[PDB]
């Protein structure tokens, strides 16, 4: 089956888990297709076995760092000849955030991964990272159309590039995706033909058809307000309201929402590092570079999330490992849970994705997303046997999902805790 693994780190594991060598380093690997926001070519190509025939790399123009002559050796020069680059040109303020690997092995086997890390050395080892791993797939003629496959093909087509169509989509078309029949592939694309993002994700959740209702988000970036005039958060103001049916598609004042959440017993969570959590991290402030929440210009937005929605949660400092401490995770998870502690062990659904909590990644009801984003959805109603999505934490390390934060999470202590602000 599909499985979540924690990325090994060159700093946290000196002496389950995965590495890029595990993924690219096997001699049965014939062809590898990559999607990332950023690539350190010499770090990446050192992960491959001599036997690989083709490495196709999709990325944003100006994000692939070439190998400099002085970094070359005999070995890299051989692997380098097998690399084909597909350059995407993006609008300003848009990112090719998607992280995706599609591997082809010797016996017509095929495996798919969503790493949360871009293919750079520091990003791989500093913040905590996870990698979702598909079940093994076979090149074979296909019967039932699989939703996961269908969505992965529309996403590939939304690039509208001839090179993707020929070098990628055609190979992916030959693969039989039956083992992924329970799961969904959810994505964002700036393409104006294909719909995506929040809009399309809402429809999917509606389509899959009393108690306390928990919605949680773990993210390395948190966008600013949706509106220049009032204070409006993507998650508290638009996403959760959509999913709970508080609003329908044809935004409410903050105060109405607070009453609605109290009356419907909605509990929102955003997990994002405190100021203090870096003090208790082994590498200290080393992984802070990746966590982005600029709230110094608009203090009332932050105060609102922190004080009125009481939205912020942090690691349980008792339950984390000594080797990883309170280092934050750069993975993104969005999840929903209904309780009639053990909260988040059984889920209505869980989305694991490269989309941050921002309008750039998701769009809104009216705006299209600006980014490319990719992810996988686990929904209760699409499960074959269980009828509930199971989740566990890597910190106690056989479930559907595994998450790199602790379970439970602990509310920010309103007397002391503050979101980490990169501006300081």
Curated annotation (Swiss-Prot):
Domain of life of the organism encoding this protein: Eukaryota
Transmembrane region(s): none
Disulfide-linked positions: none
GO molecular function: 3'-tyrosyl-DNA phosphodiesterase activity; 5'-tyrosyl-DNA phosphodiesterase activity; double-stranded DNA binding; exonuclease activity; single-stranded DNA binding
Region feature (Interaction with DNA): 221-225
Marked site positions, Interaction with DNA: 358
Main localization category: nucleus
Cellular component GO terms held in the UniProt record: mitochondrion; nucleus
Residues annotated as catalytic: 97, 330
GO biological-process terms attached to the record: DNA repair
Keywords: DNA damage, DNA repair, Exonuclease, Hydrolase, Nuclease, Nucleus, Repeat
Keyword DNA damage in annotation: yes
Compartments where located: Nucleus
Coiled coil region boundaries: none
Enzyme Commission number: 3.1.4.-
Binding site for substrate: 99, 332
Family: Belongs to the tyrosyl-DNA phosphodiesterase family.
Further remarks about this protein from its record: Present with 2130 molecules/cell in log phase SD medium.
Stated role: DNA repair enzyme that can remove a variety of covalent adducts from DNA through hydrolysis of a 3'-phosphodiester bond, giving rise to DNA with a free 3' phosphate. Catalyzes the hydrolysis of dead-end complexes between DNA and the topoisomerase I active site tyrosine residue. Hydrolyzes 3'-phosphoglycolates on protruding 3' ends on DNA double-strand breaks due to DNA damage by radiation and free radicals. Also cleaves 5' phosphotyrosyl adducts resulting from dead-end complexes between DNA and the active site tyrosine of topoisomerase II. Contributes to DNA repair after radiation damage.
Protein name: Tyrosyl-DNA phosphodiesterase 1
UniProt lineage: Eukaryota, Fungi, Dikarya, Ascomycota, Saccharomycotina
């Amino acid at each position: 089956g599909a499985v979540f693994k924690l990325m090994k780190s060159d700093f946290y594991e000196r002496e389950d888990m995965i590495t890029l060598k595990d993924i690219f380093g096997t001699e049965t690997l014939k062809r590898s297709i990559l999607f990332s926001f950023q690539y350190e070519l010499d770090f990446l190509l050192r992960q491959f076995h001599q036997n690989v025939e083709n490495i196709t790399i999709v990325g944003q123009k100006g994000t692939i760092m070439p190998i400099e002559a002085r970094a070359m050796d005999a070995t890299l020069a051989v692997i380098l000849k097998k690399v084909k680059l597909i350059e995407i040109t993006m609008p300003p303020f848009a990112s090719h955030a998607t992280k995706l690997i599609i591997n082809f092995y010797d016996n017509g086997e095929c495996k798919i991964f969503l790493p949360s890390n871009n293919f750079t050395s520091m990003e791989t080892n500093l913040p905590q990272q996870v990698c979702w791993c598909s079940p093994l797939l076979k090149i074979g003629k296909e019967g039932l159309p699989v939703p996961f496959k269908r969505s992965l093909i529309e996403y590939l087509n939304s690039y509208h590039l001839k090179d993707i169509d020929e070098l990628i989509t055609k190979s992916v078309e030959e693969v039989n995706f039956a083992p992924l029949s329970e799961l969904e592939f959810v994505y964002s694309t700036p393409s104006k033909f294909q719909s995506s993002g929040l809009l399309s994700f809402y429809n999917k959740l509606e389509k899959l058809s009393d108690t306390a209702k928990h919605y949680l988000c773990q993210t390395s970036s948190i966008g600013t307000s949706l509106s220049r005039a009032r204070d409006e958060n993507l998650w508290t103001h638009l996403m959760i309201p959509l999913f709970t049916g508080i609003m329908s598609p044809p935004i409410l004042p903050t105060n109405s929402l607070i009453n609605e959440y109290s009356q419907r017993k909605i509990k929102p969570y955003i997990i994002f590092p405190t100021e203090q959590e870096f003090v208790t991290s082994p590498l200290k402030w080393s992984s802070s570079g990746w966590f982005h929440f600029q709230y110094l210009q608009k203090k009332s937005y932050y105060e609102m999330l922190r004080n009125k929605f009481k939205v912020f949660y942090k690691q349980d400092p008792a339950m984390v490992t000594r080797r990883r401490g309170t280092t934050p995770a750069h993975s993104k998870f969005y999840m929903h849970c209904a309780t009639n502690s053990q909260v988040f062990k059984e889920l209505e659904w869980c989305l694991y994705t490269s989309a941050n909590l921002s309008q750039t990644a998701w769009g809104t009801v009216s705006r299209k997303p600006r980014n490319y984003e990719a992810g996988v959805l686990y929904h209760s109603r699409r499960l074959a046997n269980t009828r509930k999505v199971t989740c566990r934490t890597f910190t106690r390390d056989p479930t559907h999902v595994a998450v790199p934060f602790t379970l439970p999470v602990i509310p920010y202590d309103l007397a002391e805790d503050e979101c980490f602000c990169l501006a300081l």
